[PDB]
Amino acid sequence: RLLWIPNATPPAHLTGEFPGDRGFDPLGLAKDPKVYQRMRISEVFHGRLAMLGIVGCVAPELFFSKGAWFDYSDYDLNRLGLIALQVIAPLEYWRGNGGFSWDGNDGPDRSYPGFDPLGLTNEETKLQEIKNGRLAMTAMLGLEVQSHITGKSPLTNLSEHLSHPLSANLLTGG
Amino acid sequence: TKFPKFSQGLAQDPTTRRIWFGIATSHDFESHDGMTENNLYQKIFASHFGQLAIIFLWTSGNLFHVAWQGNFEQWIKDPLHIRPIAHAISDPHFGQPAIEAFTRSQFPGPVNIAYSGVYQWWYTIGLRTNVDLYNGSMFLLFIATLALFAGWLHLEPKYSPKVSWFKDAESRLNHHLSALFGLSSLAWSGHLIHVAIPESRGIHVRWDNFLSQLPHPSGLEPFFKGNWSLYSENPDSLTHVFGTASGAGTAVLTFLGGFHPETKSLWLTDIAHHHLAIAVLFIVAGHMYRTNFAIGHRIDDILNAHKAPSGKLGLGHFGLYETINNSLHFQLGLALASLGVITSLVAQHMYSLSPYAFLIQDRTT
Amino acid sequence: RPLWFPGGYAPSWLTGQHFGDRGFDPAGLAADPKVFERMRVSEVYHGRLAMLAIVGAVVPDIQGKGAWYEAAQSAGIGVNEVAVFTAAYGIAEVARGLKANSDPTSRYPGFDPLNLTTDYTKEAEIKNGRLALTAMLGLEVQRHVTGVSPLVNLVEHVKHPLGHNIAESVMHQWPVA
Amino acid sequence: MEITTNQVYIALLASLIPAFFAFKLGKSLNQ
Amino acid sequence: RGLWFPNITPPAYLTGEFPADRGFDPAGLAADPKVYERMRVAEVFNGRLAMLAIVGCVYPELLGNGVWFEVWNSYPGFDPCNLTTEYTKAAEIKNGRLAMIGMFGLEVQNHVTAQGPVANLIEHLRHPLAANIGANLAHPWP
Amino acid sequence: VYARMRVSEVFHARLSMLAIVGAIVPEVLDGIKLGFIAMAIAAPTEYWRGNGGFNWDYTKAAEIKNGRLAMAGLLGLT
Numbered sequence A: 001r002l003l004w005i006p007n008a009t010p011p012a013h014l015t016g017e018f019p020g021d022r023g024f025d026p027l028g029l030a031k032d033p034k035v036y037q038r039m040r041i042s043e044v045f046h047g048r049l050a051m052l053g054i055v056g057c058v059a060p061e062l063f064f065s066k067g068a069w070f071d072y073s074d075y076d077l078n079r080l081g082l083i084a085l086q087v088i089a090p091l092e093y094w095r096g097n098g099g100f101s102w103d104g105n106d107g108p109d110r111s112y113p114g115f116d117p118l119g120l121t122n123e124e125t126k127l128q129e130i131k132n133g134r135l136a137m138t139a140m141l142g143l144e145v146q147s148h149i150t151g152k153s154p155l156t157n158l159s160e161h162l163s164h165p166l167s168a169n170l171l172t173g174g
Numbered sequence B: 001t002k003f004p005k006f007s008q009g010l011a012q013d014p015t016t017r018r019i020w021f022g023i024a025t026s027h028d029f030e031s032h033d034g035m036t037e038n039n040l041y042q043k044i045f046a047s048h049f050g051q052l053a054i055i056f057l058w059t060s061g062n063l064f065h066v067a068w069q070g071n072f073e074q075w076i077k078d079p080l081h082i083r084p085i086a087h088a089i090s091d092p093h094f095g096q097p098a099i100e101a102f103t104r105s106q107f108p109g110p111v112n113i114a115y116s117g118v119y120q121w122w123y124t125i126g127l128r129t130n131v132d133l134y135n136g137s138m139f140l141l142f143i144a145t146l147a148l149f150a151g152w153l154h155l156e157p158k159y160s161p162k163v164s165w166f167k168d169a170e171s172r173l174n175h176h177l178s179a180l181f182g183l184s185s186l187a188w189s190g191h192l193i194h195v196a197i198p199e200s201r202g203i204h205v206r207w208d209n210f211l212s213q214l215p216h217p218s219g220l221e222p223f224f225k226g227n228w229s230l231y232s233e234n235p236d237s238l239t240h241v242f243g244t245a246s247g248a249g250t251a252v253l254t255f256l257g258g259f260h261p262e263t264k265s266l267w268l269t270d271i272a273h274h275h276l277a278i279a280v281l282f283i284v285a286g287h288m289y290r291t292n293f294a295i296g297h298r299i300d301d302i303l304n305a306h307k308a309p310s311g312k313l314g315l316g317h318f319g320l321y322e323t324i325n326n327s328l329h330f331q332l333g334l335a336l337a338s339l340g341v342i343t344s345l346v347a348q349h350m351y352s353l354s355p356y357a358f359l360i361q362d363r364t365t
Numbered sequence C: 001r002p003l004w005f006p007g008g009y010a011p012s013w014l015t016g017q018h019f020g021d022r023g024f025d026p027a028g029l030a031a032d033p034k035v036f037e038r039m040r041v042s043e044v045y046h047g048r049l050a051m052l053a054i055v056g057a058v059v060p061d062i063q064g065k066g067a068w069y070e071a072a073q074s075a076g077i078g079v080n081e082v083a084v085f086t087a088a089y090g091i092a093e094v095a096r097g098l099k100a101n102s103d104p105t106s107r108y109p110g111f112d113p114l115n116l117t118t119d120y121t122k123e124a125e126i127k128n129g130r131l132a133l134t135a136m137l138g139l140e141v142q143r144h145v146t147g148v149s150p151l152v153n154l155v156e157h158v159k160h161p162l163g164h165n166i167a168e169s170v171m172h173q174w175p176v177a
Numbered sequence D: 001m002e003i004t005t006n007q008v009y010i011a012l013l014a015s016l017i018p019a020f021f022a023f024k025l026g027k028s029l030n031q
Numbered sequence E: 001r002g003l004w005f006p007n008i009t010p011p012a013y014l015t016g017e018f019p020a021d022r023g024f025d026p027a028g029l030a031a032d033p034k035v036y037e038r039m040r041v042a043e044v045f046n047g048r049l050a051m052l053a054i055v056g057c058v059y060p061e062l063l064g065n066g067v068w069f070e071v072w073n074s075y076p077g078f079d080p081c082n083l084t085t086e087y088t089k090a091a092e093i094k095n096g097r098l099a100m101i102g103m104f105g106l107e108v109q110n111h112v113t114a115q116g117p118v119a120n121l122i123e124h125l126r127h128p129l130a131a132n133i134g135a136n137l138a139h140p141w142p
Numbered sequence F: 001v002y003a004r005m006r007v008s009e010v011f012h013a014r015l016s017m018l019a020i021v022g023a024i025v026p027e028v029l030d031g032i033k034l035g036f037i038a039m040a041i042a043a044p045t046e047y048w049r050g051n052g053g054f055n056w057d058y059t060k061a062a063e064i065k066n067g068r069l070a071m072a073g074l075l076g077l078t
């Protein structure tokens, strides 16, 4: 039984069975088997988006000589939003639904729908997904807060911390 | 004691022989205790990945130390009069006179002059800045990583190939001749035409502009119509300065022979034509053996056919295919013989037909 | 019983159970059993903190940012900045000091991601601690008697061992820094 | 131009990745 | 049998008996086998006609005679050597469906870009991050 | 099939209703500024509409008939 802090009490709702459980729920939001099930879905899905997000922020600027991710003065958000929502609507629905039928439950698992050509699904890979997801979520929170405190690009933040570690902290702003 | 675990006989020895003979038999996998053919081929395949990674890390380190501690950009300004640097010296044992003796260039400290000729080779193929080198270094570190991961992965039981996969000669020969030799040669022709030859004529082409920058003024229309000669039209002059547009040409594929007068090296457009012509040969070669599509030769049939009617060779090459396919030492012997010959070839040819800019003037390299 | 001094005499209260018992208490400071456990806590604490200190007194002097006694004022850090640190450190300190001196977690809070807790590692902690504690004592005293940086002290002694040692140093008026 | 101290740091931390993979492959080849 | 989606339960009427069946009908057309027969005629025909159109839309532009949208100004038996196996039958089905999605492609690209499909390919290959669907639609499209 | 066909025909009906009625009234009296907020408001509701909640007989033909007219009326109106 792995634990989020040393010398801790794993709460009774968290059993040690589902991938990623390290006995962390101080607010107690996962007592019921069904609400735990839904929050599990939401965790993995927040994870997967965050991972795409953190790549989608860093890689353009680092590899394709772009600007910071929070410079939206290139496009009208309403147009992209309308296009994006039209495209995303059936996908997020079919996910929630379970399938293409009206009472969709036509086979897939709703979190692990079986999109693996290479055949690599096991408990270990599941835990790896959760751990990379949690790290990426943390990172994406950091990107947002850093954006609002420093007003500078994330790579620029990393460069200034590396150059001057004693003065470019959270304790001095940067 | 325990070491070596692959030999119980050695691991019972109560002497210091155990240690020495343990190190000296560690890579001789056939002689290991309870070795099967499957396990033998799988450890060979992984070790091969390990060798590849070591080679890519070595290259990555040459690139890194030259980008960080060398004088590649200064050397590029004055190739015939600046000495290239390998790395810095950080030996606490040195005295102040030795520090003053080994301090050559503008670097703040003692350096080693490089004699490997990597400066001439990098400058010829288009690199021009320490950032170029550094990015190459990082790429190669990534390819190393891939090799090491592949090594581990193909050692897992689900991806461990079977002996039949290892003994598939015709397929390997097709893939290795068509792709490894052929398509890698065509790619190199692509690098030379799209990056190196421009850089030799002053135009700076990198990943951020190569998709737009036309490597020839006429595009691919000449290629597809059949007017191939248009790619040889206006070669560089005998007054051309490497790296500038002064006296430069437009041709991308020639057959001039001899050397570029300033660099005293072969012309790059002849090197591009070379790599393209042999690519076409290797790709055609790689479509000769029978795999899974009913066309092609079976190697045993070729072997079994060649027998002199006089009987002066006996039964000729009968039975050789299973002999060679089942023997790794035969295969290693044939490879090393071939490589031996080719290495001497590279030595005999690179001094006489020098292919790199400003390398013949560097006498020690 | 390995002891601190040859002859084979240990105090009665020091039996040889705890880690680092070498029969060393000639001032009887651990005779009472309740004081012993507190002291066993503070030895490891002092030890760990000194270990950090000694590594932190050498590394910025190697890097060429001045010696440890001239490293505060060289980068600012006044008495207000030690006050803010001391307020910040207080939270962890009272969290530590809420538990008893009899609980094994009071020394060993369990943060072991590599899983390297054995008995060999506990004695090794206590031994490296006591070595660093004497090293800090050494730093302070050397600072005052010689009046130069510790790395200077070490370098002079390695190059000229008769030249620069304690005997030479203590034959001048020594409170100099 | 001159490779900066930052680019040395990134190079080091990157190099830690094939160190780990080396260890993995070594352990696997060693029975 | 391969399916068009992973883990979906296939319809009962679509079971692998025809060339290149991948159990795809999630609206419900081919339930009655007679309808499935006429659709199989329609799919083979529209596919062969789409593949003809694909060559007839690209090859004129490749030659350099003009662009296809500016220019407006069942198994029968015809065959020498019978290669008609289930492989080749299914291959004809596949290439037909691909070319249909192709022709869907050209009939959207002509309206979005207003340029030739070759030029579309060349301009992607010359500016990928600026001449894709996500940059043609993002700004108001002619 | 009819399971959903019914509910589509119902929804298409009520859709056509609002459109045909609220096409006349601005006539007898942009599309990206408001289209985005329309889809953004439609997405939380049409999900719950489809799901059944917040979880992971005259007028059973009257409105279908009047709906089918409003569907066909819009087909004229285009």
Ligand code: CLA
Pocket (backbone or CB within 6 Å): B054, B057, B058, B059, B060, B061, B062, B064, B065, B087, B088, B089, B090, D008, D011, D012, D015
């Ligand atoms: C692979 C061959 C290679 C070789 C022979 C060297 C050699 C050297 N390096 Mg360099 N180094 C390398 C790759 C290499 N490097 C790479 C790829 C990087 C970028 C990550 C560096 C980053 C680096 C720094 C920052 C420094 C050196 C330094 C040095 C010098 C002293 C040794 C040292 O301190 O390195 C320590 C080693 C590292 C910092 C990481 C090395 C990573 C490689 C891949 C090691 C593995 C080699 C090989 C695969 C092992 C197989 C051998 C085995 C079969 C017996 C020495 C000349 C020092 C120097 O410049 O002194 C003047 C120094 O400060 N190197």
Ligand SMILES: CC1=C(C#C/C(C)=C/C=C/C(C)=C\C=C/C=C(C)/C=C/C=C(C)/C=C/[C@@]23O[C@]2(C)C[C@@H](O)CC3(C)C)C(C)(C)C[C@H](O)C1
Pocket (backbone or CB within 6 Å): A024, A025, A026, A027, A028, A029, A046, A047, A049, A050, A052, A053, A054, A055, A056, A057, A069, A070, A137, A138, A140, A141
């Ligand atoms: C578990 C638990 C608890 C908890 C918790 C915690 C810490 C939860 C918090 C989650 C956290 C911290 C994070 C979420 C995800 C971030 C996402 C999805 C980012 C998307 C990223 C995307 C998709 C961004 C996209 C773009 O950037 C791209 C790619 C390019 C840019 O140009 C433009 C935009 C912006 C569009 C309690 C409450 C503490 C106690 C309880 O008892 C138990």
